C-alpha cells in the first residue's frame, strides 16, 4: 500500500518508538509482531499511535491478533496475497476472528462450547418446544455458566422466540 501493510499469517512499545524517533531525528519500517507482549487494551491503540507520532513513514507489520486488525482498514490487510472480503476497521474482534482468521468464536475442543448451538438445534428439532432433552441441556447451561451469562441470556431468548413463533403459527 502507501501507509500501512499488515500481512496476517505499553512499556514494550516504548523502546520501539524511542529507537525509531532517535533514528528519525538523527537523520520503511519492518515492524514484526506489533502485538508482542501487549495487553489486549494497548493492542487497540498501537496503530493509532504510530500513524499519529509517525505521520509520514511507510509501515509493514506482521500480525495474528484480531484486535490490532480491527484498527486497520481492509485495504492494508494482505493475508497469505489477496485482502479479505470484510472491512476490519471498526468491526467486532469476534467477527474479524471468524471471517478473516477462520477461528470459531468458542473453542472446538471444549465440549462445553457446543451447548448453546446444540441447544438451538435441539429446540428447532421439536418445533420450538422444550420437551425433555433440550430442557436438560438448558439446565446444564445454567448450572455451568451462570444464572445470567451470555450463554444463558441467549438460550432464554430462544425459548421465547420459539414460543412466540409457535403461538403465531397456531393462529395462522
Amino acid at each position: 500500500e502507501e501507509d500501512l501493510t499488515v500481512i496476517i499469517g505499553q512499556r514494550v512499545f516504548l523502546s520501539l518508538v524511542a529507537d525509531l524517533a532517535r533514528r528519525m531525528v538523527m537523520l520503511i519500517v519492518l515492524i514484526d509482531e506489533i502485538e508482542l507482549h501487549l495487553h489486549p487494551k494497548w493492542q487497540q491503540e498501537v496503530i493509532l499511535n504510530l500513524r499519529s507520532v509517525f505521520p509520514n513513514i511507510q509501515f509493514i507489520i506482521t500480525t495474528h491478533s484480531p484486535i490490532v486488525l480491527s484498527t486497520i482498514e481492509k485495504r492494508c490487510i494482505r493475508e497469505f496475497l489477496d485482502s479479505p472480503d470484510m472491512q476490519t476497521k471498526g468491526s467486532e474482534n469476534a467477527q474479524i476472528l471468524e471471517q478473516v482468521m477462520n477461528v470459531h468464536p468458542t473453542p472446538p475442543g471444549i465440549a462445553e462450547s457446543h451447548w448453546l448451538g446444540d441447544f438451538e438445534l435441539l429446540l428447532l428439532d421439536n418445533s420450538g418446544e422444550l420437551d425433555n432433552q433440550s430442557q436438560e441441556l438448558y439446565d446444564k447451561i445454567k448450572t455451568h455458566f451462570g444464572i445470567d451469562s451470555a450463554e444463558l441470556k441467549k438460550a432464554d431468548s430462544l425459548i421465547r422466540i420459539n414460543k412466540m413463533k409457535n403461538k403465531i403459527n397456531k393462529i395462522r
Binding site: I147, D148, A150, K153, K154, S157, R160, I161, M164, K167
Partner: protein, 210 residues
C-alpha cells in the same frame, strides 16, 4: 434506573437518630428486607442483579450529616466494600457531584433524563436542554453507566440477546390485530420485571415513553 416507590420505612430506623448514633451500630439485616421489596433484587442505580450488595446514601453521610438514618436517603447499590460503578464510585471516583444535579430514582422518573440505546449506551434523553440536560449528563457520570466496561458490556449482551426477539414481534404487527399484539407486547414487558437491566430492555422494547 427505574422509578422506585418508597412506601413505608423500616421500624429499625426510628430508635437511631443522627448525631449520637453512627451508621455502623445499625443492624443492616433489618433494612434489607424492606429495600428488597422496593427495588426488587436489582441495583437502584444500574439495575444489575444484587449479588454483592450494600446500602448507599444518595446524599453521602459525610457531606450531609443528618439524613443518615432517614429512610428517604437509603438505596441499595451493587458494590460491597469487600468496584467501578454506582455506589462505590459515587464516593471514591467522581470528584464533584453536587447532589441536586443527580436523578433520585424514587422521586424523579429516571426515564425523562435517560435513553438506553440498543447498543447498551446510556445517553441523555432526546431534546433535553438547560438544567434537565445536566441531570442526565451527571447521573451518567457519577453512577458510571457508560464508562465501565463490565457494565456497558453486560448491558449490550442483555439488550442485544433479545434484539432478534424484538424484531419478530414488531414484524408480525401489520398482520396481527391491535389487541392481540398489545397483549403479546405486555406479556413480553411483564417478564423483564424479573430480569437484569429491566429498563434497558424496556427501552429496546417500546420506548422511553416518548
Amino acid at each position: 434506573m427505574k422509578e422506585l416507590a418508597r412506601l413505608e420505612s423500616p421500624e429499625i430506623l426510628d430508635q437511631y437518630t443522627a448525631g449520637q448514633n453512627d451508621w455502623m451500630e445499625i443492624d443492616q439485616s433489618a433494612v434489607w428486607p424492606k429495600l428488597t421489596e422496593m427495588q426488587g433484587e436489582f441495583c437502584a442505580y444500574c439495575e444489575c442483579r444484587l449479588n454483592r450488595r450494600h446500602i448507599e446514601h444518595f446524599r453521602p453521610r459525610g457531606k450531609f450529616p443528618a439524613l443518615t438514618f432517614i429512610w428517604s436517603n437509603l438505596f441499595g447499590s451493587c458494590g460491597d466494600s469487600k468496584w467501578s460503578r454506582c455506589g462505590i464510585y459515587k464516593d471514591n471516583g467522581a470528584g464533584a457531584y453536587n447532589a441536586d444535579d443527580l436523578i433520585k430514582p424514587d422521586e424523579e422518573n429516571p426515564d425523562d433524563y435517560l435513553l438506553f440505546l440498543t447498543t447498551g449506551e446510556v445517553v441523555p434523553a432526546i431534546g433535553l436542554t438547560g438544567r434537565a440536560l445536566k441531570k442526565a449528563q451527571e447521573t451518567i457520570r457519577v453512577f458510571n453507566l457508560n464508562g465501565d466496561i463490565k457494565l456497558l458490556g453486560s448491558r449490550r449482551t442483555a439488550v442485544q440477546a433479545i434484539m432478534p426477539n424484538v424484531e419478530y414481534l414488531y414484524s408480525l404487527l401489520e398482520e396481527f390485530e391491535e389487541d392481540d399484539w398489545n397483549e403479546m407486547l405486555r406479556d413480553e414487558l411483564e417478564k423483564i420485571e424479573s430480569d437484569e437491566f429491566k429498563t434497558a430492555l424496556k427501552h429496546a422494547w417500546t420506548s422511553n415513553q416518548e
